[PDB]
Design a protein around this nucleic acid. Structure first.
Ligand SMILES: [Zn+2]
Lengths: 142, 203, 83, 140, 141, 63, 69, 101
RNA sequence: AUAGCUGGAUCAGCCAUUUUGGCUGAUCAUUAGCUUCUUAGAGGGACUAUUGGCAUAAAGCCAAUGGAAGUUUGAGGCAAUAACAGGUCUGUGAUGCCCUUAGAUGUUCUGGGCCGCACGCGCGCUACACUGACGGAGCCAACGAGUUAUCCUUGGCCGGAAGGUCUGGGUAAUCUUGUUAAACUCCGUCGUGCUGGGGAUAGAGCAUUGCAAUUAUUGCUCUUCAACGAGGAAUUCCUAGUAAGCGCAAGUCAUCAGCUUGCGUUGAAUACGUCCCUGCCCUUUGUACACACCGCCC
């Protein structure tokens, strides 16, 4: 009727849907999901233990909203100010080693597909999954 | 009515021919002041104070400006916090909420009374020319009352919230509440009392 | 034979400052009086149709103490696009 | 076919409103007015709707295509587009009297709802890091 | 959120550090010189222990487990690249500096570089900056 | 009793060393007479109400 | 010194005197009690999950909570 | 059915407009349906340099700019017409490109 | 059709549906028609017009409607006569004079130094946190730049994104690029203690740039984590999209910004004055000064 992922919060979807992704058994979190900082501009380590799940299922929303993205583009997106000590800060790219694995896990799930003349796109399966969950959160109230 | 978009039934008019604050601090009523009805501008509502109007290209466009807007402007100080109006209005919105919870009055009339009472009345200005250090007592214009009061509250809140668990919004709310009913305990009122006393002594 | 040259004779010669500067330089190299040479060129350009001319000779004219002599005469613009 | 296009801007930003026949549909870039990025500035973009009234704002479909500037510029541009879409729609397909009825209120209370702000960034001069402020000198 | 009336032993000690009484796990054993912020989390996950609870409630069995993983991380499927020291001079293996061994090896290596008379060693002897840091206007008093 | 409300009727000019204060003439509300010359630091315009606690001073000028 | 762990005294003190003051937040909890502040955040959450306290403008940093009447 | 594209890159607006007028005149002399000359954005080369040849004096800078304007066209000229038009429309200060791709 | 808008062939799926579809869209020289958002040549558009005010009622200003503008509409470029013993002989195959030349101050090569510190002075960056710091998420611009031997780089492959291998685009409003940037926003954690604030200093090793990196190139995985617990006499810049904070591009480039030249986002406090300090312009006035008060003289 009037429902789309264009007006829905998808961050809260991941926390509830982590169980469903485990039921599907296609996330395949790598062994280094506890040591890596997900970017050099980061300082200590990720805090939330579901960081890989949240990043994956939110990059899916990012790819939905976008036309087509690549690994390097996603690294630039997931950056920030880097504390360079006494020198003034600047912008540094993210961690390609975790961006590529996150996208590849999404492709194995099925929400993503490789687009022609582009890095990656979002499948109809991912489009329908995102729309259905967006409808659930938009319609559950009252 | 209802359309395809949800449009939640919370942001209705709920005004009575006004615009109101962000659906809680309220506006309209009478407000009013004793001697700043010409220098304090409380007319139509301002749902959020983050307005980008031009109020400095002329001399008295600052006078024809909202008191809360000038409070945000005088709060966006301490240059490490310069140019953050979103942070300033978030602090002000928080300060309005705690004021409304702490005191029965809505957080507009109390602020008007606070700045009205906080503004200095007699000031010992320097004569000048150096060496003489004589100084003389003079009066204060209503525009100077607004800016002096707003500055006094902002520095008072900032200094008293610089290092303590109490947040800036709570400190500003407490300062405004104390400065409203002449408590002689707030930093702004204490400074204005000292300024009036020294002006009287130097007179 | 990919490049060829055509030698045009002249399109006026009393208003092009480079030609007059060369003539003044050659006269100074010959050894005529600086004022007389600066005059001669200024009369030449004025007859050629100049509205206002300025000749400035700077350096060691007669002694070690170098100086600059200016013989500006006429209408001169020190401004933007007009200048 | 009731279709009309409008434009609005706040300097470096711009916004296009594709007003069309319908009801509601005040979405911006595919998302409604309730989900602008700055949560603390949503009432500013909702201001043109409530200045006139939801009763007189019905009967239009406004789609915005903002681009450029910052977040404050984006919300200013979309509110400008949503404020001029209704005026042009009610000028082209409704009586000019009602258009003026909307306009008088929309000008009586507005933060330059249809007047572009002419303020611009001053160019920077050599000798300092800002347009007007120059670096300090030792003097000794 | 958890059971409040439990047994506690306040102050606890492990590996040359008098850890405070009631602090969270990471803030508790970060006092020991040699462990890291990412090192704290990875050993906490590898030792099969919680993170929200305070370190005081830790029992002897978990203390023994944390000692074993701290002393021998290599034997528990951890590549040597994590450790700061690898392929040492005398033995030829990798280990971690957590106890007084860090100061002992630092002094021994300092004596070794004094013996071999390197430029970095001479700078260390003169108490100057070993790397290319300007000493023209800094390093005062 | 000590609270006096005065209304400015005209402005005279800048006085003092730096011009930081201005000499003005004020008139009370309940009393039409008694035009009082005063010195005010900040900018002052018409239709303003001045709150005063000491009025029997009759300041002439600021040096 | 601010308390680090609840000792069966602070819990009953807050559960009894939480409606004493009109404004409830981390700062006022550290003021009235001797709470560190992390426990103040957890106490605000543990009192807001029930009907003991009422949310007003809780978001970002400041936790704005008030007495039921 | 051949297609052409003249770069028409030049540094002077007056000379570019004159040669463009000549080109469109030759175009409408044969009625090849053409395309309107698309004015590509004027690419500007801007540099800054210090006035003084040494380090003494107040820090003053000079900014120099050079403007380049570019156009384009589309034709359907055969071999005889294209060789005639190329021999005719040659003008100073303008670079012309020929392609048939 | 070196950019978008729409239909057209063109396929993916439901909440409703076989008039009940919206919406998201994939491809696109398979095709057509338009330049309103992009492009710039010509253009219209400000004269403080107008009623009201003041000034010997002529030369302007104040507030206001209309407008994009009224401070010269903002900001720059060019900028008079005369002068400096102002800087540059090390920008110049620009230069007079002097010096030097085979055992060379000419040229070339190696290494070192220019960075060397008991100290003093300036231009600057980072902080001295709760408005904080850190972690999961969403994402908002402008000025520019890039290869014929050899730059800007897209897509694919394993892992300590430091990086590497293969394949393709761009000599360019098409590729980079839609510079999806930072600051920013939601939630959570650390809870005021020189603390997970501040990362100076040092220990070990991992790649890239380069004859090659030692006196650590640069960045990187780790550990220690100090002075700073918000600065005296003094002094600097600044009047509106200005100050200030934040980031980006370019110059110098084999590599290296804490610098400069420009741009953009957020965005103010105070004045609408004065000669009080510090200088400048004009007139009168005094002078025993005239390289002229940093004078002259006793
Ligand atoms: Zn040179």
């Amino acid at each position: 009727a009037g429902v789309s992922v264009k007006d829905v919060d998808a961050q809260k979807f991941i926390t509830a849907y982590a169980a469903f992704l485990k039921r599907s058994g296609k996330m395949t979190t790598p062994q280094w999901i506890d040591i890596v900082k997900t970017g050099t501009h980061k300082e200590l380590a990720p805090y939330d233990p579901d960081w890989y799940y949240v990043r994956a299922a939110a990059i899916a929303r990012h790819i939905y909203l976008r036309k087509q993205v690549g690994v390097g583009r996603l690294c630039k997106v997931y950056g920030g100010s880097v504390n360079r000590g006494m020198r003034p800060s600047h912008h540094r790219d993210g961690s390609g080693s975790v961006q590529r694995k996150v996208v590849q896990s999404l492709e194995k799930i099925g929400v993503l597909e490789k687009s022609d003349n582009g890095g990656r796109r979002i499948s109809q399966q991912g489009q329908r999954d995102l729309d259905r969950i967006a409808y659930s959160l938009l319609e559950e109230e009252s | 009515m209802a359309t395809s978009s949800l449009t939640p039934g919370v942001s209705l008019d709920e005004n009575g021919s006004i615009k109101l604050f962000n659906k809680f601090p309220f506006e309209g009523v009478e407000v009013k002041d004793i001697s700043l009805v010409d220098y304090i501008t409380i007319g139509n509502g301002q749902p959020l104070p983050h307005t980008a109007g031009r109020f400095q290209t002329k001399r008295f466009r600052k006078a024809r400006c909202f008191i809360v807007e000038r409070l945000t402007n005088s709060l966006m100080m301490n240059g490490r916090n310069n140019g953050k109006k979103l942070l300033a209005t978030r602090i002000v919105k928080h300060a309005f909420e705690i004021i409304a919870l702490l005191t029965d009055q809505n957080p507009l009339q109390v602020l008007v009374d606070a700045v009205a009472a906080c503004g200095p009345r007699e000031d010992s200005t320097r004569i000048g020319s150096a060496g003489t250090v004589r100084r003389q007592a003079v009066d204060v214009s209503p525009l100077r009352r607004v800016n002096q009061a707003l500055a006094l509250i902002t520095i008072g809140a900032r200094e008293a919230a610089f290092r303590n668990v109490k947040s800036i919004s709570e400190c500003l709310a407490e300062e405004i509440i104390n400065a409203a009913k002449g408590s002689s305990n707030s930093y702004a009122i204490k400074k204005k009392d000292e300024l009036e006393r020294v002006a009287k002594s130097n007179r | 034979n990919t490049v060829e040259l055509y030698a045009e004779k002249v399109q006026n010669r009393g208003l092009c400052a480079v030609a007059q500067c060369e003539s003044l330089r050659y006269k100074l190299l010959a050894g005529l009086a600086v004022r007389r040479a600066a005059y001669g060129v200024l009369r030449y350009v004025m007859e050629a149709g100049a509205k206002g001319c300025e000749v400035v000779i700077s350096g060691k004219l007669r002694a070690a103490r170098a100086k600059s002599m200016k013989f500006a005469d006429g209408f001169m613009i020190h401004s933007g696009q007009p200048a | 076919m009731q279709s009309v296009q409008c434009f609005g801007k706040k300097g470096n930003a711009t916004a296009v409103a594709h007003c069309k026949v319908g009801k509601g549909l005040i979405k911006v870039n595919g998302a409604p007015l309730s989900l602008v990025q700055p949560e603390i500035l949503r009432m500013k973009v909702y201001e043109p709707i409530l200045v006139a009234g939801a009763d007189k704002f019905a009967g239009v479909d406004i789609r915005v295509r903002v681009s450029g500037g910052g977040h404050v510029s984006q919300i200013y541009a979309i509110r400008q587009a949503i404020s001029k879409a209704i005026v042009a729609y009610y000028q082209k397909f409704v009586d000019e009297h009602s258009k003026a009825e909307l306009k008088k209120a929309l000008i009586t209370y507005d933060r330059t709802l249809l007047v572009a702000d002419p303020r611009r960034m001053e160019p920077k001069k050599f000798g300092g890091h800002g347009a007007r402020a120059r670096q300090q000198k030792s003097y000794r | 959120s958890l059971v409040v009336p439990d047994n506690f032993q306040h102050i606890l000690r492990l590996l040359n550090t008098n850890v405070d009484g009631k602090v969270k796990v990471m803030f508790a054993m970060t006092q020991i010189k040699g462990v890291g912020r990412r090192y704290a989390n990875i050993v906490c996950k590898k030792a099969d222990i919680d993170m929200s609870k305070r370190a005081g409630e830790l029992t002897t069995e978990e203390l023994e487990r944390i000692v074993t993983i701290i002393q021998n991380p290599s034997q528990f499927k951890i590549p040597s690249w994590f450790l700061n020291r690898q392929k040492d001079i005398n033995d030829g293996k990798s280990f971690q500096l957590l106890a007084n061994n860090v100061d002992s090896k630092l002094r021994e290596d300092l004596e070794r570089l004094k013996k071999i008379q390197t430029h970095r060693g001479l700078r260390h002897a003169l108490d100057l900056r070993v790397r290319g840091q300007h000493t023209k206007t800094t390093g005062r008093r | 009793v000590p609270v006096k409300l005065a209304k400015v009727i005209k402005v005279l000019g800048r006085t003092g060393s730096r011009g930081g204060v201005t000499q003005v003439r004020v008139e009370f509300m309940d009393d039409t007479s008694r035009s009082i010359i005063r010195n005010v630091k900040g900018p002052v315009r018409e239709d303003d109400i001045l709150v005063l606690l000491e009025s029997e001073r009759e300041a002439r000028r600021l040096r | 010194q601010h308390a680090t762990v609840f000792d069966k005294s602070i819990i009953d003190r807050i559960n009894k005197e939480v409606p004493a003051f009109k404004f409830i937040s981390v700062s006022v909890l550290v003021d009235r009690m001797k709470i560190n502040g992390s426990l103040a955040r957890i106490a605000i959450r543990d009192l807001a999950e029930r009907g003991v306290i009422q949310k007003v403008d809780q978001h970002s940093k400041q936790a704005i909570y008030t007495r039921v009447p | 059915v051949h297609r052409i594209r003249i770069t028409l890159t030049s540094r002077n607006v007056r000379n570019l407009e004159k040669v463009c007028s000549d080109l469109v005149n030759r175009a409408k002399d044969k009625q090849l349906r053409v395309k309107g000359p698309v004015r590509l954005p004027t690419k500007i080369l801007k540099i800054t340099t210090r006035k003084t040849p040494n380090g003494e004096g107040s820090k003053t800078w000079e900014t120099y700019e050079m403007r380049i304007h570019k156009r384009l066209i589309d034709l359907h000229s055969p071999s005889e017409i294209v060789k005639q038009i190329t021999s005719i429309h040659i003008e100073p200060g303008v670079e012309v490109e020929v392609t048939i791709a």
